[PDB]
Ligand binder design. Structure first.
Ligand code: CA
Ligand code: CA
Ligand code: CA
Ligand code: CA
Ligand code: CA
Ligand code: CA
Ligand code: CA
Ligand code: CA
Ligand code: CA
Ligand code: CA
Ligand code: CA
Ligand code: CA
Ligand code: CA
Ligand code: CA
Ligand code: CA
Ligand code: CA
Ligand code: CA
Lengths: 74, 278, 66, 63, 64, 274, 274
């Protein structure tokens, strides 16, 4: 009857589950690579942010000096 | 010279088995003793690592006749993902049995409904460069003005088994070498029980831009053994005497200042790496 | 039983979908971080030019009371 | 076990989903802050340029 | 066995997911620190904005 | 349509502060491409000039969960004249953040005795246009002193509150003063009502160039002040099509002049009648 | 330039008819050889499908006197959506009668209460071409999902209305729907404006081959709808130089591609965006 079809249904669903697992592997691999690139980008942006902050500091110092000179002119 | 091999092929649907027929090979090279050969043929299924069969040995013949048949216990559904390999070995009493020539037949192209039998010219066997040692990814960032070199050990993968009965206990040690001298020894943490360790650990060094082209950076992946000296899994080196992808990464680091460049590197055997170091 | 294998199959597919959401989430992460990276580049440009202009103004103000 | 591997994997997956979600929202906030800092930076360099102009005038005037 | 390949896949996927967990954590920490950093930078930005505006104001006023 | 929002509301009498609770929104429109929006909610007092609070941003979700609460330092006595506005916005990286949908709760209708939590459907945030059209005829006879305003019909009036309950009120104004207040019947459930209703007024030939006729189309609200759909004015200080119709009416005595007119916002009309 | 025309206009409410008065034209171009034209005036309703009336022909005169009037059986209520076109033609014996110059009067702006009579300068009847050129750069980054449109400049746009007030509006369209509406600044009095204005949009790498970018250059009119100078579209279903620029942009990521584009008529562009 549908016995054969039942067995082949079991095999089929097993296949679907397996290929599903393969898809999982590929997806977590891609996720992994994207994650690494993300981390490196975060590093770059981080160092950039540090240099920007130090830049703001230097701007602050220089502007303080200019402020002093303006108070001298006043 | 390319010899020929006559083979038979048929599938038994009743018992779910593959019938491999070794008839004869023709036009064989004048190897082994001068003027004649002693050829023995080894047949095996490529995906499977099951015990390899070998035909009888024939003494002193360039045109040997085996007329032997083998049976492979293989399901018909899984045969779609298999491939038959026939390799024509040679014989040497006091030497290593050099392989004369092999060839492979994809089972997906074979019609087992009709009895198959074909002549196939042999091809020179492919050679592996080494056992899979592994890869390691890290990023390189260099800023000339400050002279700081930031090496962020990102990760590694496909590392070779070291500890017996176990996978690995990997860690990374970076050596800043110059003039055959080890100067700075920095290492990462130990990631227990893994073949794909994750570090994401930043390191820093002092490197003036006047000496940037005269320094060597040795990234060494090792396995931790609880007792005894920790055996080294592999190692790579960038900088002076660097080749290929390493020199590529170094050049990328130089071409990109104040910016990190993440890259993968294929590990080589410790001996050859130590050899390439002047 | 077919029920057992089918349930196993269902749980497996659920795991696959969860990992898909995680995947899209990681890609989204990388994308956002990238765009932010470019915006950061622009900020850096503006800050540097600001440093230049500040330097000029400071130089002139210092040289004014001389 | 066979089912236990699936359960453990599922738990880990959903956990990483949560964490990563939190992180994505954090990167949204970061995006806002970066937009604001962008605007402030542009305005700042503009005003700095104007102050450079005024400084040039006052220097060329009082020296 | 195919179930063996399946289970192996499950194990590899699990480990990789754990790795993605660590990555996510370190990522989160860095993001947090950089957010704080952005806050500091914006504060300094407003301060320097104020100083520049006032200095330019007085500078323009001193014209004459 | 535009969606629902579940909100909480409670007043703390001890610390003299208002607690506004944002829980979660449901069934939100797709708005931006990729199949989902990036929603965050701005909540503010209707009359506060203070910075308006905003919730955290949620990435790609039509059903976001904020679970945030805001506090407004506001006296209980003065809260009666305030209304609360909750606006749902969509986050966009390189563009102006388009608002998903907002809605308002009158504080005079809120029972602060019980902790409030309710689902409320969002409303269309912004309208680009500023009402509808109305056709009527004008007849003036100098010798008799009769001003005949026959409300003919209307069309394309905006839906209020059911669909609408439109009706026409004619105000005879002079020197900024309302003299006669006439109204038409109500045509239930329609955006294009038909009246054909004749009205008559007393306008001496000494004051014909000194009168204002303000036709106002309104919608009836069962509870509260009946909201205004639109209004127009013809006669003295009249502009455009209105002035055209009036001048035509003056040039043609003992004869009706049928014309359409586009309704204008109540504010500008009330301002121009000063 | 092209000349002036003195016309009369009045509506008869009694007989329900429109009276169009052609008196005389002044300062007409020479057009045909021999030093003078042979003018006659065709007058017609803007929307009438009926035979269009024409005055008598005057031989060799730049300042002709017709003194003719035409009648259009048209209701006062339906006249609001019509415009009147007066076209001055030159008579030629063996050739196609070249039109000297035409002009149009919107009936919604006409006060029919007073008998109208006015001098109006003729306008250039026909244009052979169908707008102008505009240069901009395109940048797309798949990983970031950024679409950068930097409006660089424009040149040779046609004069509108003063000379012109050109500006650029960028419309991000998808599936025939307008998603984001961005606009540039206005460069006053110029036919070759310079902008150099950067814009950015969100375009996922799943939809990059499914988006349309419609750049429209318009002129600002102080009163009325701002007339369109021209418009182009790049991306999906894009043609010629546009498709070239888009395909080049796709082949070159993280890199800007600057290019010129010839503006097309609004009608054909709006038709092709269906
Ligand atoms: Ca890969
Ligand atoms: Ca940092
Ligand atoms: Ca710092
Ligand atoms: Ca031999
Ligand atoms: Ca031998
Ligand atoms: Ca070991
Ligand atoms: Ca070990
Ligand atoms: Ca924030
Ligand atoms: Ca903020
Ligand atoms: Ca949006
Ligand atoms: Ca969004
Ligand atoms: Ca209470
Ligand atoms: Ca009602
Ligand atoms: Ca002619
Ligand atoms: Ca002629
Ligand atoms: Ca009349
Ligand atoms: Ca204009």
């Amino acid at each position: 009857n549908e016995l054969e079809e039942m067995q082949r249904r079991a095999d089929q669903l097993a296949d679907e589950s397996l290929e599903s697992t393969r898809r999982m592997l590929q997806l977590v691999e891609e996720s992994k690579d994207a994650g690494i690139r993300t981390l490196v980008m975060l590093d770059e942006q981080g160092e950039q942010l540090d240099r920007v902050e130090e830049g703001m500091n230097h701007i602050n110092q220089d502007m303080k000096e200019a402020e002093k000179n303006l108070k001298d002119l006043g | 010279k390319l010899g020929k091999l006559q083979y038979s092929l048929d599938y038994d649907f009743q018992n779910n088995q593959l019938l491999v027929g070794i008839i004869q090979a023709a036009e064989l090279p004048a190897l082994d003793m001068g003027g004649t050969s002693d050829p023995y043929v080894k047949v095996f299924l490529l995906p499977d690592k099951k015990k390899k069969f070998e035909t009888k040995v024939h003494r002193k013949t360039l045109n040997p006749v085996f007329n032997e048949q083998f049976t492979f216990k293989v399901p018909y559904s899984e045969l779609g993902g298999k491939t038959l390999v026939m390799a024509v070995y040679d014989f040497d009493r006091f030497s290593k049995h050099d392989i004369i020539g092999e060839f492979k037949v994809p089972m997906n192209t074979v019609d087992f409904g009709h009895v198959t039998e074909e002549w196939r010219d042999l091809q020179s066997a492919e050679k592996e460069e080494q056992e899979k040692l592994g890869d390691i990814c890290f990023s390189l960032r260099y800023v000339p003005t400050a002279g700081k070199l930031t090496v962020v050990i990102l990760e590694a993968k496909n590392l070779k088994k070291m500890d017996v009965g176990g996978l690995s206990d990997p860690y990374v040690k970076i050596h800043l070498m110059q003039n055959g001298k080890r100067l700075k020894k920095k290492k990462t943490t130990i990631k227990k029980n893994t073949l794909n360790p994750y570090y994401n650990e930043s390191f820093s060094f002092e490197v003036p831009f006047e000496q940037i082209q005269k320094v060597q950076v040795v990234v060494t992946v090792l396995d931790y053994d609880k007792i005894g000296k920790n055996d080294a899994i592999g190692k790579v080196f960038v900088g002076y005497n660097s080749t290929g992808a390493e020199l590529r990464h170094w050049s990328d680091m130089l071409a990109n200042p104040r910016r990190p460049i993440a890259q993968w590197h294929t590990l080589q055997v410790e001996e050859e790496v130590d050899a390439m170091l002047a | 039983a077919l029920s057992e294998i089918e349930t196993r199959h269902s749980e497996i597919i659920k795991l696959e979908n969860s990992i898909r959401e995680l995947h899209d989430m990681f890609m989204d992460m990388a994308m956002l971080v990238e765009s932010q990276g470019e915006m950061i580049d622009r900020i850096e440009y503006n800050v540097e030019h600001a440093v230049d202009y500040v330097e000029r103004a400071v130089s002139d103000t210092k040289k004014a009371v001389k | 076990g066979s089912n236990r591997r699936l359960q453990q994997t599922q738990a880990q997956v959903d956990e990483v989903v949560d964490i990563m979600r939190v992180n994505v929202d954090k990167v949204l906030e970061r995006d806002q802050k970066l937009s604001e800092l962008d605007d402030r930076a542009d305005a700042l360099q503009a005003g700095a340029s104007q102050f450079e102009t005024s400084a040039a005038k006052l220097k060329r005037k009082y020296w | 066995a195919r179930e063996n390949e399946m289970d192996e896949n499950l194990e590899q996927v699990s480990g990789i997911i754990g790795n993605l967990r660590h990555m996510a954590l370190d990522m989160g920490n860095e993001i947090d620190t950089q957010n704080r950093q952005i806050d500091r930078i914006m504060e300094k930005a407003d301060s320097n904005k104020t100083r520049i505006d006032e200095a330019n104001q007085r500078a323009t006023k001193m014209l004459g």
